[PDB]
């Protein structure tokens, strides 16, 4: 049970947009379908030397500082049927979450309630014609899983999000 005592240092972690180009005798094929949805035969596609400016942000339940959908909210999952599988959601418009070491994160109430009904306009049923969509919060598990954990200014934040995922829609 390996323990390692390194000179634990107070550094500042900053994200450098990472570009991933073609690896050796291989070629990167970007699908240009504005609304490509996961698995499937991409129609419009083209070879590229490198992907794009990818910002490697480590965090939970909320993907941040990344790529948005240019058309509508697009969701993706390996199997929308198996409840055990993660469902990723690509948003239409960015939302802001301002945080400080003082223990809080505030995000606009209106901006976020709107994205919720948008995401609600297509959940599991599969853009289902209609049914009741409910947003509750984590059942349990690790702190990093149960809360929006992320690395802010070098420090590790564990933001309680019950208020973001506790509502009902149709």
């Amino acid at each position: 049970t390996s323990v390692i005592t390194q000179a634990c240092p107070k550094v500042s972690f900053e994200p450098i947009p990472i570009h991933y180009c073609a690896p050796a005798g291989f070629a990167i094929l970007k699908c240009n379908n504005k609304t490509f949805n996961g698995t499937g035969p991409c129609t419009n596609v083209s070879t590229v030397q490198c992907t794009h400016g990818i910002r490697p942000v480590v965090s939970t339940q909320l993907l941040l500082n990344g790529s948005l959908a240019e058309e509508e909210v697009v969701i993706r999952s390996v199997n929308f049927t198996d409840n055990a599988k993660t469902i990723i959601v690509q948003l239409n418009t960015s939302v802001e979450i301002n945080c400080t070491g003082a223990g809080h994160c505030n995000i606009s109430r209106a901006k976020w309630n709107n994205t919720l009904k948008q995401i609600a306009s297509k959940l599991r049923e599969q853009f289902g014609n209609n049914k009741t969509i409910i947003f509750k919060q984590s059942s349990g598990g690790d702190p990093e899983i149960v809360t929006h954990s992320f690395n802010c200014g070098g420090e590790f934040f564990y933001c309680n999000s019950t208020q973001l995922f506790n509502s009902t829609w149709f």
Binding site: F13, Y20, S77
Partner: protein, 35 residues
Amino acid sequence: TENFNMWKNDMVEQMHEDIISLWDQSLKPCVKLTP
């Protein structure tokens, strides 16, 4: 054209290992892992 893509990779496994190896060189702690 007319190609296939999916919930597999490109750089998912690659990137993951780059980022894991990036964090290590940057945010150094006082680790404890179980073998």
